[PDB]
Curated annotation (Swiss-Prot):
Residues 1-18 have a biased composition (Basic and acidic residues). This is Small ribosomal subunit protein uS15. The keyword Methyltransferase does not apply. It comes from Bacillus subtilis (strain 168). GO terms for biological process: translation. The lineage of its organism: Bacteria, Bacillati, Bacillota, Bacilli, Bacillales. The gene is rpsO.
Amino acid sequence: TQERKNQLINEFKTHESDTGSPEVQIAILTDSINNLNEHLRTHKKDHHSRRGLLKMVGKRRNLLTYLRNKDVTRYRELINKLGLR
RNA sequence: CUACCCAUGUCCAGGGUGAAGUUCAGGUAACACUGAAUGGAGGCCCGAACCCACGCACGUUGAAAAGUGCGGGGAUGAGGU
RNA sequence: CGGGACCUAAGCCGAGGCCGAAAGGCGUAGGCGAUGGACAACAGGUUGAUAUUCCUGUACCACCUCCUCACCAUUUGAGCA
RNA sequence: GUUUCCCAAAGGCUGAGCUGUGAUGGCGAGCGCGAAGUUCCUGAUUCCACACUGCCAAGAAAAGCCUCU
RNA sequence: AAGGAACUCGGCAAAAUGACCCCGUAACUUCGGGAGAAGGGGUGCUCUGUUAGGGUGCAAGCCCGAGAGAGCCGCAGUGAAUAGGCCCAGGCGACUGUUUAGCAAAAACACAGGUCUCUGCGAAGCCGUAAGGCGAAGUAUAGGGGCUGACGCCUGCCCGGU
RNA sequence: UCCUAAGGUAGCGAAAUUCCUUGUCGGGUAAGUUCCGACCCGCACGAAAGGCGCAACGAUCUGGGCACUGUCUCAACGAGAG
RNA sequence: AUUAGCUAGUUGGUGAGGUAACGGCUCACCAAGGCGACGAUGCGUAGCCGACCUGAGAGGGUGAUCGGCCACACUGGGAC
RNA sequence: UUGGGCGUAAAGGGCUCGCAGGCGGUUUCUUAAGUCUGAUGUGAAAGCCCCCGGCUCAACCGGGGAGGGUCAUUGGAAACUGGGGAACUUGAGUGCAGAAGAGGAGAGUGGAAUUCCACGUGUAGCGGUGAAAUGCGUAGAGAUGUGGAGGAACACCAGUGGCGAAGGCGACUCUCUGGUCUGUAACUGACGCUGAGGAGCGAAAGCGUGGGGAGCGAACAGGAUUAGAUACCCUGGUAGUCCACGCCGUAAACGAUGAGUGCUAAGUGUUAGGGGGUUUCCGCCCCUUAGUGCUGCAGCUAACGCAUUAAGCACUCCGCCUG
C-alpha cells in the first residue's frame, strides 16, 4: 500500500503507462488480500472487514476468468508469478 | 492373616477393535470439509497364566474349622502379588 | 555372585536442644536400614554328599614393592585430589 | 553455568554382536578308548533399550565415577 | 426311539452354539457404537504345483501357500480334545470398579459431573491437654465438610417453629 | 366458606410404593393373581432423602419367543468310585 | 424431490462361445468405469397412435367402437 | 405463452458473496447452429375440412382435393441471435488528486448520575398513590458534607442529519480495517447485470461453560384495587440485560415497495463536492454529480395515494400468490 503499489505498477508494465491493465490490478488485489487476511487472524470476531474480502475475492475471480478467454499464456504466466489456485 | 497406606523391584500367552493425529490427493480466496494411506490411543473386546467366588452338584464324626469337580466375571489399570 | 567392611529411600534409632502429673512419643546433627544403585569368573571333569569354590585349563580385580625398566620433577616443584 | 563471535560435518562418549585367538584343548554317537563334528532355514517373552517415537497421570535418592580448584 | 417345558418357585440342571475364511446385518443412538446383531454358506484328501505370489540366498535350495480347475472318499469332513446360545421388551442402577475372609456381588457403596457452605495461610478441618510438622516443599482455577449421582430436559411454593 | 408461615406446579401414576385387589379396560395364552400398553377415588409419588426419559452396560432382576434338550409324563441300560 | 444418490456383467477392453444378425448376449481374463440436477435410481399410475369431444384459437380431457402396432392366452418356466 | 399479479386486496426471500443456468455496449470481417426460403422424399386409408354425386331428403355413403411434421435430405438468403477474427470507449474497473464519515474489530481512558458503605452534622418520620397500605425508621432513616468500592448507561451536540447491504452503530483517544462520493483521462477494451441450490452476516428473547451483576427486572411474594385480580398501580424481588467464546438464525428483519440500466414538467430545502461569475473575502447568483425530505404536471391507480428516490412507460434476470 502506497509503496508496494509503487513497485507493482512498475512490475507488470506491458506498456509504460499501464495504470489499468488488469494484470496490474490483480497485483494490487492479491497483496491487498494478504494484508487483509492477516488481520482476520488477529481478529476473528470482526465481520465488517470480511464484506471487503468477499468483494476482493469476487473482483479477483472476475479478472482471472476474463483472461482465460482472451490471453491464454498471459493468464498462465500471471498465476506462475503468484501461485494462486 | 487381614484393612487401607508408604518407599521399592517385578510379572500379564496371543488375536481382534480401531479414535486423536500425521501425510498425500481432492477441495476451498483461505480455514471449514472430503477421500486414501499411515499412525496406533482405550478403567476398549474375546481368551490363558494369574487373581476372584456365581450357579448347581459333591462334601458336612468332610481330603479340607470353607475346599475339589463341570462351567463363570475381570485379565494394561480404580489391576495382581 | 549371595550378604558384610559401598551408598541410600521407606521407616526407625536418636548428642544437645524443644526446660515434659514419673515414665516418656523420641528434634536436627549423625548413623542404622535393601527388594534398589554399585561392583572381579567361566568351562569341562569329579565322589557314595560339595561345586560360577575342589581339581585341570585359562582369566581378571583392587592392594604392596623385597625389585627391575622407563619417564618426569624435587618449590611453576612432578604427582596426589 | 550462562554471554558473545568462528565453523557445520567432524569428533567424542556408547554399545548387542561379529571374526581372530582362546582350540598342538575340552566335549562328542559309540565301546579305559573315541569318529565326523559343516551349511541353510525358522526365530522370540531375553539383548541393543526406556534406544526411538507418542501420550499424560509428569515418572527415588546418595556413593562409586569424571572434573574443578 | 415318539414328545418337547407339560417339569418346576423359575430352561436350576444338563444338552444345543463355538474354529478361521467369505457374504449379509434391523430398531434406536449421546454417532463412538449397537454388531461377531441376526441369518445362512464354503473348510478333508489327491492331481494341474519344487505354483500364482512372496520371504530368504549370489546362485543352488529352503520356508509362507492366494485363488481356482480337476477329480476320489465316507453318514460326517474346525471329523479327536477346545474355544459366544441368540432375539423381543421392562424397571432399578449411567458406566469398568468394591464390600457382607468363612449365608447374603445387588437395586447397596464408590464414581465423573452438579452443587450450597466453611477457610487469607500459623487457613479451616484433623490427631488430640502442650510440642512437632500432617493439610502442603500447597495457597480460593487450592483444601477440608455435608447433600445428591454421567449426560439431556429440569430443580416450583412456605422464613412461622427449629 | 372457614384454617395456614405456605397449601403439591412441571413430569410421572395399582409404582421396588396400592390397603380394599386379582381395581376396571385392552394385547400377550386354548387358560395369564405375575409381565407390558393406557385409565385416575395418587389409603401413603414428587423434584438434588431428588423428579422424569435415556443409546451403550451387568454371574442384577421380572416377562415373552425361537433353537435344542431325560427337566418331565415314564423310566431304561452301560462304565466306574464307595 | 415429503423419491438424491443409484448400478459390479454394472461399465470398459481383449479373446472365446453363442445367436439369421450387431453386441456382456454368455463366460474367462484385464481395467475401473458408467448413470445424474437438462432429475438418474425409485414409487404410485396407465397399452400407444391416426384420431374422439371441447375451445374462437393457443390449449385442456379421453384413448371406447372402426383402422395401425406391441404385449397376453388359467398363473409361471422351458422346448420342439 | 397468445391471455394476470405483488404499497395496503392472496404475494418480495431479512440482507448479502456468489458456482451452475439466464441474458449483452459499439464498429467490422467471416461462418451458417438458430432463422428465412425453394426443390425433393414422406406424414397410409377411414375421420375433421373444400367441392361434387349417390341413396324418397336427412343422417349415412361415395368421388376428388386440401390440411396436418419443432420431418429428413439438398440448394439458396446474411440484417438480427449464436460462433470465430480484428478495432472504438460511453458500461464497469484501475491509477492519480481530493473530501465526508456514530462503518467494523481490538487494548486503554475519563465526566456527571443511581445505589451501596465509612463518617460528620442533624430529628421524626420519610417512602409511595386515584386514595392508601405493605415496606424504611429512635438500633438514628430521609435530607445534607467529604471520602470509598463497583457496575452499566454514554446528556449537551441531536437534525425527514452522517454511514453500512440489512440487522444496526452515538463519551474520548490510539492501533488495525472495509466500502462510499468528487476531480479528470493516465490505463484496460465489455472485463458487465442478475443469480436456484451452496456460503457468511443477522436487534431482542432463549441456550451451554465460566466471568461480573449498580440501576433496571419476567417468574414469584407482599399491600391495595375489585363481585373475581393468577392484571394495569404499589415496595421488594430471581433469571436476565453486561463480557469473552459457542449455538439458535426468527420479528410490523417495514419504504408493508426483490436487484440493476435508461427515459419522462417543475419548484423546494437540506448533507458532501466540484465549475464559473465581480470579489482575498464574507457573500450572493448560476451551472453541475451524489444520497437526503416535502408540495406538485403528464401518465399509472379500484380509491387513498405514488409522482427524476415511481406505484410512469420499457427490458433482462430471482423469489412469491391463486377464496
